[PDB]
Design an enzyme around this catalytic site. Structure first.
Site, mmCIF file in Angstrom:
data_model
loop_
_atom_site.group_PDB
_atom_site.id
_atom_site.type_symbol
_atom_site.label_atom_id
_atom_site.label_comp_id
_atom_site.label_asym_id
_atom_site.label_seq_id
_atom_site.Cartn_x
_atom_site.Cartn_y
_atom_site.Cartn_z
ATOM 1 N N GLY A 45 0.836 -1.189 0.000
ATOM 2 C CA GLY A 45 0.000 0.000 0.000
ATOM 3 C C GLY A 45 0.872 1.241 0.000
ATOM 4 N N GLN A 50 3.075 10.000 1.560
ATOM 5 C CA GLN A 50 4.392 9.385 1.622
ATOM 6 C C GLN A 50 5.360 9.787 0.515
ATOM 7 O OE1 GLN A 50 2.536 5.385 2.425
ATOM 8 N NE2 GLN A 50 4.445 5.129 3.591
ATOM 9 N N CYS A 91 6.061 -0.195 7.709
ATOM 10 C CA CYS A 91 5.750 1.002 6.928
ATOM 11 C C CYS A 91 6.949 1.391 6.070
ATOM 12 C CB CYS A 91 5.399 2.154 7.879
ATOM 13 S SG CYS A 91 4.885 3.705 7.093
ATOM 14 N N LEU A 92 6.705 1.772 4.819
ATOM 15 C CA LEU A 92 7.799 2.170 3.938
ATOM 16 C C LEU A 92 8.464 3.459 4.439
ATOM 17 C CD1 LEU A 92 6.220 1.444 0.427
ATOM 18 C CD2 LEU A 92 7.876 0.070 1.696
ATOM 19 N N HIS A 133 -4.315 1.913 7.972
ATOM 20 C CA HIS A 133 -2.923 2.359 7.979
ATOM 21 C C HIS A 133 -2.729 3.485 6.950
ATOM 22 C CE1 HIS A 133 1.588 1.359 8.092
ATOM 23 N NE2 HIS A 133 1.482 2.124 7.021
ATOM 24 N N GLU A 134 -3.281 3.314 5.748
ATOM 25 C CA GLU A 134 -3.147 4.321 4.690
ATOM 26 C C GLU A 134 -3.925 5.599 4.998
ATOM 27 O OE1 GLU A 134 -0.859 3.813 2.741
ATOM 28 O OE2 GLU A 134 -0.678 1.629 2.976
ATOM 29 N N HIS A 137 -2.064 7.855 7.295
ATOM 30 C CA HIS A 137 -1.038 8.658 6.637
ATOM 31 C C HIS A 137 -1.628 9.974 6.134
ATOM 32 C CE1 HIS A 137 2.681 6.402 6.510
ATOM 33 N NE2 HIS A 137 2.092 5.322 6.031
HETATM 34 C C1 LIG Z 1 0.431 -4.255 7.817
HETATM 35 C C2 LIG Z 1 -0.106 -3.376 6.690
HETATM 36 C C3 LIG Z 1 0.670 -2.137 6.229
HETATM 37 C C4 LIG Z 1 0.190 -1.315 5.025
HETATM 38 C C5 LIG Z 1 1.256 -1.138 3.920
HETATM 39 C C6 LIG Z 1 2.766 -0.911 4.150
HETATM 40 C C7 LIG Z 1 3.348 0.155 3.185
HETATM 41 C C8 LIG Z 1 3.105 1.581 3.651
HETATM 42 O O1 LIG Z 1 4.011 2.142 4.265
HETATM 43 N N1 LIG Z 1 1.931 2.155 3.404
HETATM 44 O O2 LIG Z 1 1.694 3.337 3.836
HETATM 45 C C9 LIG Z 1 3.498 -2.210 3.776
HETATM 46 O O3 LIG Z 1 3.450 -2.711 2.644
HETATM 47 N N2 LIG Z 1 4.198 -2.721 4.794
HETATM 48 C C10 LIG Z 1 4.977 -3.956 4.729
HETATM 49 C C11 LIG Z 1 4.409 -4.925 5.757
HETATM 50 O O4 LIG Z 1 4.535 -4.577 6.929
HETATM 51 N N3 LIG Z 1 3.730 -6.038 5.384
HETATM 52 C C12 LIG Z 1 3.546 -6.449 3.971
HETATM 53 C C13 LIG Z 1 2.709 -7.702 3.976
HETATM 54 C C14 LIG Z 1 2.371 -8.047 5.393
HETATM 55 C C15 LIG Z 1 3.044 -6.994 6.270
HETATM 56 C C16 LIG Z 1 3.929 -7.742 7.277
HETATM 57 O O5 LIG Z 1 4.354 -7.164 8.292
HETATM 58 C C17 LIG Z 1 6.508 -3.792 4.837
HETATM 59 C C18 LIG Z 1 7.366 -5.058 4.674
HETATM 60 C C19 LIG Z 1 7.162 -2.601 4.145
HETATM 61 ZN ZN LIG Z 2 2.924 3.337 5.961
#
Ligand SMILES: CCCCC[C@H](CC(=O)NO)C(=O)N[C@H](C(=O)N1CCC[C@H]1CO)C(C)C
Ligand SMILES: [Zn+2]
Ligand SMILES: CCCCC[C@H](CC(=O)NO)C(=O)N[C@H](C(=O)N1CCC[C@H]1CO)C(C)C
Ligand SMILES: NC(=O)CN(CC(=O)O)CC(=O)O
Ligand SMILES: NC(=O)CN(CC(=O)O)CC(=O)O
Ligand SMILES: [Zn+2]
Lengths: 169, 169
Positions: A45, A50, A91-92, A133-134, A137
Site C-alpha cells: 500500500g 508518503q 511502513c515504507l 494504515h493508509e 497517513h
Molecule cells: C500491515 C499493513 C501495512 C500497510 C502497507 C505498508 C506500506 C506503507 O508504508 N503504506 O503506507 C506495507 O506494505 N508494509 C509492509 C508490511 O509490513 N507487510 C507487507 C505484507 C504483510 C506486512 C507484514 O508485516 C513492509 C514489509 C514494508
Molecule cells: Zn505506511
C-alpha cells in the site's frame, strides 16, 4: 516514474492531505507513479502523503504476484464492530521496523474509484488493516504513534542515525 | 410475520421480479417479514421471489448472531474479475442440497439501500457469492440451473417425493 518515499521523522509526513476534487488524467498519472513506487519498494500500500504529494489518494495491491491493483481516492472508513485485532505492521516510511498495532477488526470503506465514482466496501483481514494504515497517513499519522513513547523514541533515534550515515555516502 | 418459502420445482420460483419504484410502508413491512423468515429458516439470504412476492428485494445477514442485516433493493452486479471461485451452495428453496457452483470471486453491486438511496458496493468472498445467488432468484434462476441435467432432475425427483410424503403427514 519512481518517486522518493519520505521517512520518519520527516515533518512532511505530518501534513494533512487535501481532498481530490476531480479525478483527471493528471491524478491518474500520480496514481501510476505511486503504484510503480509501491511495487518497487516493495510494499502492499502507499499514500500520496508518503511521496510528498498531499492529496487524499491511496493505492494498494494485496496479491503476491502484484496483479490486483486497487485505488482509493478521498477514502474514509468506519468501524463495523468494537472487536480489535492485533497485526504486526511495517511502513515504507519507517523502514526496517515492525511492531504490533491494535485496530478495528472490520470496517466499511467509502471512497471514489480511479474514475471518480463513489463506492463502499466492507473490509476484514489485511484489507482492513491496510486501509486504516493508509488513511492514517493522510491524516499525518504513523503507526509508531500507537506505540509507547520509549519504543517510538528508540525507532526515531535509530532512523535518524541511519539518515546521517546515508548522508555520508 | 413469518412467510412461507416456495420450494423447487414450484413454477412460481421462475417468475421474474419487477423493480421497486418507491420504498414505501408496504415495502418496509415486507423487508421486516423477510428478515424474520430468513432468521427462522435459517439462512443467510432471502429474495422476495422465494416468499412469492415478485419485487426486486433482497435481504442478508452473513453473521452468526443476527448482528449484520443487509438490504438490497433493485440490485444488479457486474463481475470485476475473470477468476472463478467454487463454493458449496445451498438454497432455502432447495432444502437439503449443497452443490459446487463456480462464480466470479469479485463483483461490483449497484442497488438502493433500506432508505431508498442508491449506492455501489465492491464485494468479495461470501458476500460476492450471496449477491449473485440472490440476484439470480430475482431473474427466476436457481443454483441447480448451473448443474448437469441429470443432477438437477435427480434433485427435482427427490424433492417431489419429499413434498409428496409431507402432504400425507
Ligand atoms: C500491515 C499493513 C501495512 C500497510 C502497507 C505498508 C506500506 C506503507 O508504508 N503504506 O503506507 C506495507 O506494505 N508494509 C509492509 C508490511 O509490513 N507487510 C507487507 C505484507 C504483510 C506486512 C507484514 O508485516 C513492509 C514489509 C514494508
Ligand atoms: Zn505506511
Ligand atoms: C452460498 C450462498 C447462498 C445464499 C443464501 C441461501 C439462502 C437462500 O435460499 N437465498 O436465496 C443460504 O442461506 N444457504 C445456506 C448455505 O448454502 N450456506 C450458509 C453458510 C454457507 C453456505 C454453505 O453451507 C443453507 C445452509 C440453507
Ligand atoms: N471497482 C473497483 O475496482 C473497486 N475499487 C478498489 C478495490 O478493488 O477495492 C476501485 C479502484 O480500484 O479504482
Ligand atoms: N452502508 C450500508 O449499510 C450498505 N447497504 C447494504 C450492506 O450492508 O451491504 C445498505 C442496506 O443494508 O440497506
Ligand atoms: Zn436461494
Amino acid at each position: 516514474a519512481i518517486l522518493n518515499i519520505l521517512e520518519f521523522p520527516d515533518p512532511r509526513l505530518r501534513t494533512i492531505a487535501k481532498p481530490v476534487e476531480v479525478v483527471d488524467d493528471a491524478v491518474r498519472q500520480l496514481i501510476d507513479d505511486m503504484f510503480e513506487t509501491m511495487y518497487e519498494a516493495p510494499g502492499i500500500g502507499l499514500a500520496a502523503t508518503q511521496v510528498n504529494v498531499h492529496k487524499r489518494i491511496v493505492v494498494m495491491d494485496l496479491s503476491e504476484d502484484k496483479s490486483e491493483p486497487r485505488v482509493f481516492i478521498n477514502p474514509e472508513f468506519e468501524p463495523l464492530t468494537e472487536d480489535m485485532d492485533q497485526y504486526q505492521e511495517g511502513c515504507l516510511s519507517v523502514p526496517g521496523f515492525y511492531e504490533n498495532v491494535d485496530r478495528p477488526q472490520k470496517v466499511r470503506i467509502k471512497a471514489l474509484d480511479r474514475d471518480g465514482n463513489p463506492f463502499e466496501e466492507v473490509a476484514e483481514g489485511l484489507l482492513a488493516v491496510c486501509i486504516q494504515h493508509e488513511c492514517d497517513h493522510l491524516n499525518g499519522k504513523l503507526f509508531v504513534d500507537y506505540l509507547s513513547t520509549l519504543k517510538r523514541d528508540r525507532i526515531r533515534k535509530k532512523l535518524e542515525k541511519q539518515h546521517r550515515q546515508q548522508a555520508h555516502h
